[PDB]
Design a protein around this ligand. Structure first.
Ligand SMILES: CCNC(=O)Oc1ccc(-c2csnn2)cc1
Length: 119
């Protein structure tokens, strides 16, 4: 990550952009596995093997409360969603596939956000 991403505090205008990025992901057709915390009745071992769970509703709560001080911290929570999924599930499962698609979409939107900050 470049210096701006790591060091530049998030302003109120930056927060309007983060809200837009998050809503784009929540509306994506392949976001269904990630919208809410994993239900342990569906996956009884999940919370024994994933030490730091994350989901898009937790990120929305954090954005509303202004939890994030730097863009790097927002990117780290999002990346945890996808990395947790690829560690828990095998590479041929539909959950793994959804992580591949949605991470590529996140990178496209994140590049758009970074461009808009500087110019
Ligand atoms: C293997 C058990 N069968 C099953 O479908 O349970 C789940 C439920 C949710 C997830 C999930 C969503 S986000 N990443 N992991 C994975 C497995």
């Amino acid at each position: 990550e470049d210096a701006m991403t790591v060091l530049t505090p998030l302003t109120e205008k930056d927060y309007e952009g983060l809200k837009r990025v998050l809503r784009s992901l929540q509306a994506h057709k392949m976001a269904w596995p990630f919208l809410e915390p994993v239900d342990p009745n569906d996956a009884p071992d999940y919370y024994g093997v994933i030490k730091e769970p994350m989901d898009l509703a937790t990120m929305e709560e954090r954005v509303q409360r202004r939890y994030y001080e730097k863009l790097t911290e927002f990117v780290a929570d999002m990346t945890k969603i996808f990395d947790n999924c690829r560690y828990y599930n095998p590479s041929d499962s539909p959950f793994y596939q959804c992580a591949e698609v949605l991470e590529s979409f996140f990178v496209q939107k994140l590049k758009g956000f970074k461009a808009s900050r500087s110019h």
